Swiss-Prot record:
Name recorded for this polypeptide: Transcriptional enhancer factor TEF-4
GO cellular component: chromatin; cytosol; intracellular membrane-bounded organelle; nucleoplasm; nucleus; TEAD-YAP complex; transcription regulator complex
Domain of life: Eukaryota
UniProt-annotated location(s): Nucleus
Gene: TEAD2
Predominant location: nucleus
Function: Transcription factor which plays a key role in the Hippo signaling pathway, a pathway involved in organ size control and tumor suppression by restricting proliferation and promoting apoptosis. The core of this pathway is composed of a kinase cascade wherein MST1/MST2, in complex with its regulatory protein SAV1, phosphorylates and activates LATS1/2 in complex with its regulatory protein MOB1, which in turn phosphorylates and inactivates YAP1 oncoprotein and WWTR1/TAZ.
Naturally occurring in which organism (per UniProt): Homo sapiens (Human)
Length: 206
């Protein structure tokens, strides 16, 4: 494993962004967080993050026990909060098999899951491989609201205290066979005001 994905399914691109209202006159967009995938990864023992993802029904521990462990990843984001406008999300997956994907995204605060988003995406055959595009999707309102409140905070260390208790758990399944294809745990810090967004992908091990 050398990227975010397995032998069956790769997450090739993901962006959470805002376009300022004057993007019509001169186009610009700000990337809060971004993964671009257009030597093996470091590992992280899944026991360490078990408390950040609530030990509740359907949670990370339960899924990880079920396996297969090669499908489980941790992504650390350093979010760029230095920027109303259009708040948007884009993602792209690739596979070599034709599948219908069910993508579940669970947003958690402290212990509890707060919101969940479920999407189904069909494959398009492009150049021998199957692509799953969900581009320019409207960012869910809970997180648009979270970002506005987050950047009202007066100190960088306060944003990290808030983001310490903030996680996203993503589960991609083959809708027709119900087998898990990918499970990614997302944890967050704020990047210093000088540095743009950055990310690091780990394999989850036990
Ligand atoms: N992490 C993640 C996974 C990666 C793939 N994901 C999606 O494909 C996806 C789908 N729907 N959707 C949303 O409506 C909102 C977000 C989103 C917005 C803002 C931030 C914020 C960034 C700054 C710090 C607070 C969170 C983080 C995430 N991501 C996604 C979500």
């Amino acid at each position: 494993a050398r990227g975010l994905g397995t032998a069956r399914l790769q997450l090739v691109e993901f962006s959470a962004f805002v376009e300022p209202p004057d993007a019509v006159d001169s186009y610009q967009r700000h990337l809060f967080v971004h993964i671009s995938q257009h030597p093996p990864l470091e590992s992280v023992d899944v026991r360490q993050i078990y408390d950040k993802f609530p030990e509740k029904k359907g949670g990370l521990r339960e899924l990880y026990d079920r396996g297969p462990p090669h499908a489980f990843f941790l992504v650390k984001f350093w979010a760029d909060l230095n920027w109303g406008g259009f708040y948007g999300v884009s993602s792209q997956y690739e596979s070599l098999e034709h599948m219908t994907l069910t993508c579940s995204s669970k947003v958690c605060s402290f212990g509890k899951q707060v919101v969940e988003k479920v999407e189904t995406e069909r494959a398009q055959l492009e150049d021998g491989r199957f692509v799953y595009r969900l581009l320019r999707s409207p960012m869910c309102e809970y997180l648009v609201n979270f970002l506005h409140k987050l950047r009202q905070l007066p100190e960088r260390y306060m944003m990290n205290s808030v983001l310490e208790n903030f996680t996203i758990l993503q589960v991609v399944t083959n809708r027709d066979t119900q087998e898990l294809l990918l499970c990614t745990a997302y944890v967050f810090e704020v990047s210093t005001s000088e540095r743009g967004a950055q990310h690091h992908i780990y394999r989850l091990v036990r």
